[PDB]
Amino acid sequence: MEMEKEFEQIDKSGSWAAIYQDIRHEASDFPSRVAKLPKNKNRNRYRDVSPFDHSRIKLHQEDNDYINASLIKMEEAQRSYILTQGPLPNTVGHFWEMVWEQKSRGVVMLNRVMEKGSLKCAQYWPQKEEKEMIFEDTNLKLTLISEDIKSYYTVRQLELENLTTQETREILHFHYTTWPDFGVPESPASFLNFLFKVRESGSLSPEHGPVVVHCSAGIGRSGTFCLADTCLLLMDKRKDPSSVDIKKVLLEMRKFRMGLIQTADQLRFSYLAVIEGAKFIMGDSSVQDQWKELSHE
């Protein structure tokens, strides 16, 4: 069923809250035993958001290999993502160790450091060229190289140095600075313009480790980003926008991490993003320039 027609049917009937609860009801449930070990309590931001044991990312150290992060492997789309929580004051070292060990090129951040007058994650990257960060626990140095600021989003070139070997890599930081907590982005066009900037960087390409995507919990906003990327990619491969069921893609993604898409509005936006983005995948290249203009970046 063409999702555009499923969309208008759900919209006119106002059954978004009902569709969403069906997804919640059928969603996978797997053990999270390592997350809930007492030694890992200060490594989790929320008590009710845990990585499954089968899909969790492991840190390469004998001490404690635990981080709140999950590998989402989409077999048909041939894309991988790591979804993680906003780093805590005591996990900033672990976060950059994961980025290093997994060979990621890109970090995608969908939240602000402060929202609704509370702290949603640590200031985990440097704000000035000449004030580099050193993570003593994981033996890494991080330096801001350059910054490109636009209306709603900012791209940063960072240099990550393994102090043990003196190897260095360029990491790209893609920061979306407009997405309300437990809410959907402003226009659909604006979100999509951000999505294509990440793609054009090569951060999502198979010659690199998986991209690291996060917000506060790493399930709501983060869920919306990788659901829309994967659905549009599946449209390109078989060329049948019709042969794409967004609900079934979501349930597949929820076998790897719990609670992806947190509200019935996030589910609705996801539909809007994919329907609007499909007006490109299917050969209207101009629409890209239109999104950029409509986004007023």
Ligand SMILES: CC(=O)c1ccc(OCC(=O)O)cc1
């Ligand atoms: C194998 C894989 O990544 C996958 C792709 C798509 C899935 O549902 C949607 C559909 O088939 O239209 C489920 C899983």
